[PDB]
Amino acid sequence: GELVRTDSPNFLSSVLPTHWRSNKTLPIAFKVVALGDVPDGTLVTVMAGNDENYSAELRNATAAMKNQVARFNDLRFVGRSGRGKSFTLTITVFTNPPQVATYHRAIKITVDGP
């Protein structure tokens, strides 16, 4: 239930692993929390990428706000960052107009995981 800051003062998130196995269910369901006043049903997506891969494959990367929290049911990281690299996670909140926030830490995704 721990929340951390994103690089936007309007959004917090739950905590993800620093390194996880490709396609494996996460230990803690991902959440995005609005501090500002965001309407129920507001869509939220996550995208992962790096210099070698603009949008790595994910699963279940869309959620909807309910009472200022968007809970991703089973977000999974499919694409591998693999070799000496990691991914930056961008959160897009579909208010009008949309807002972006970056998850605070890079995430490494490998076939074996930690």
Nearer to Cl ion, 27 or 111 (CB): 111
Nearer to Cl ion, 10 or 88 (CB): 88
Structure tokens at 44: 């939220």
Q: Is 110 in the site for Cl ion (CB under 5 A)?
A: yes
- Residues 51-70 within binding reach of Cl ion (CB under 5 A): 56-57
8 A C-beta contact, residue 83 and residue 90 = no
Burial class (CB in 10 A: 0-12, 13-18, 19+), 111: exposed
> Least separation, in Å, of the C-beta of 22 and Cl ion?
7
CA dihedral 94, 95, 100, 102 (to 10 degrees): -80
80 is in an annotated binding site: yes
71 is in an annotated binding site: no
**Choices 12-20, 25-33, 75-83, 90-98; region in contact with Cl ion by CB under 5 A:** 75-83
Nearer to Cl ion, 3 or 78 (CB): 78
Task: Return binding residues for chloride.
Answer: 53, 57, 80, 111
